[PDB]
Amino acid sequence: RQKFYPEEELVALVRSLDRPQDEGLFSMDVLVVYPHLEQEYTRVCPKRCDLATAAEKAANEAYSYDVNLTALREDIKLMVNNCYRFNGTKGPLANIAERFEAFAKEQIDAYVTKKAGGRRLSSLR
Numbered sequence: 640r641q642k643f644y645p646e647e648e649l650v651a652l653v654r655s656l657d658r659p660q661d662e663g664l665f666s667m668d669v670l671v672v673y674p675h676l677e678q679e680y681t682r683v684c685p686k687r688c689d690l691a692t693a694a695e696k697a698a699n700e701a702y703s704y705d706v707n708l709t710a711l712r713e714d715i716k717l718m719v720n721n722c723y724r725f726n727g728t729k730g731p732l733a734n735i736a737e738r739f740e741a742f743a744k745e746q747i748d749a750y751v752t753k754k755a756g757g758r759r760l761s762s763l764r
């Protein structure tokens with residue numbers, strides 16, 4: 640159980656996933672914008688995440704011990720799947736969710752690869 644990642648970098652990584660083009664789909668606090676959705680939303684989606692929650696988990700060291708950031712990738716998957724289950728698999732929002740999932744995978748892959756590249760350069764230990 641090594642600490643692979645500084646919280647400061649993982650917060651920056653999560654914040655980088657909030658794209659203006661995605662019109663707040665993953666960064667909005669759903670049950671703050673739409674308080675009336677509490678029952679229906681928690682019925683269809685009994686496990687929830689958003690980028691604000693992911694960014695707080697990053698800051699709290701939730702993700703820093705997973706070499707492939709599995710826990711963060713699972714939280715992105717959950718946000719995306721909740722969008723599909725609640726708003727459906729068809730239309731402009733579902734198109735954003737699928738582009739967002741692909742973008743998040745690329746950013747996360749690029750980060751894990753960069754860090755591994757440097758870590759493996761150590762001429763100690």
